[PDB]
């Protein structure tokens, strides 16, 4: 059987698209839940909006992880490539993508609750940030795995 069949690029394209799709769904949900919390509470306390906006920024970063992996995978696509490269950069796509989705759900829920509560207990804001960092790195772990796999996609490959 050939090492480089004609359908090999397919798993590359799916991996490339999957990296940004799932990551965007995570960032979208994190933005939505946080946005409702901010708008609900800042009606009575407008002076602290630009402090409470952090969860939206934190969710926004996750989309950037998907973008860079998607771009790095994209520039490795070619017409003739080993099937091994296809599977590897499919795995790179899924690992960051569905890790971003997981981190997105986490930021959305604690971001909403933290903002909702902080408006009547000023000491709680530092707690919200501290928890959000633990949620944030769940995306970062996905990125590290994706970049390790991607680096391995094209070295010592014969075709």
């Amino acid at each position: 059987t050939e090492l480089c069949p004609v359908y090999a690029p397919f798993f590359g394209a799916i991996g490339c698209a999957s990296a940004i799709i799932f990551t965007s769904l995570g960032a979208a949900y994190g933005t939505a839940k946080s946005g409702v919390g901010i708008c609900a509470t800042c009606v009575l306390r407008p002076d602290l909006l630009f402090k409470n906006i952090v969860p939206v920024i934190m969710a926004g970063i996750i989309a950037i992880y998907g973008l860079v992996v998607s771009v790095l995978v994209c520039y490795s696509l070619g017409q003739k490539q080993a099937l091994y490269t296809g599977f590897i950069q499919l795995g790179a796509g899924l690992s960051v993508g569905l890790s971003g989705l997981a981190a997105g759900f986490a930021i959305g829920i604690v971001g909403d609750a933290g903002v909702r509560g902080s408006s009547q207990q000023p000491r709680l804001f530092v707690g919200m940030i501290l928890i959000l960092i633990f949620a944030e790195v769940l995306g970062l772990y996905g990125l590290i795995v994706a970049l390790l796999l991607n680096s391995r996609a094209t070295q010592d490959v014969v075709c």
Partner: nanobody
Amino acid sequence: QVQLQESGGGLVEIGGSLRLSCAASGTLFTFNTMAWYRQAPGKQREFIATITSGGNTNYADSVQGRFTISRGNAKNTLYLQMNSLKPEDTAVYYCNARTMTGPFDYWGQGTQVTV
């Protein structure tokens, strides 16, 4: 695009020696097979030597013994070391890179060597 270029062309004394070099860039894989071809003026191309990704070699009897083909350490690089030249060696030389299947067969522009 994938592209190749040779190097090391020139002119030398009879019985002398020199090294030809070739490389490729922009590729996503190690070529299964790479080879050298020779064209003296007024004649068709001659097969000189070839070497697989694993180092398996084959030569034409016209260069057997006199020439040594070798892989470089960087992916998709060749060095051809030719010694004990004779005037009949005057030719342009090309390096060729080939995939195991499909139309993906590449050729450089070639370079000149003379006595």
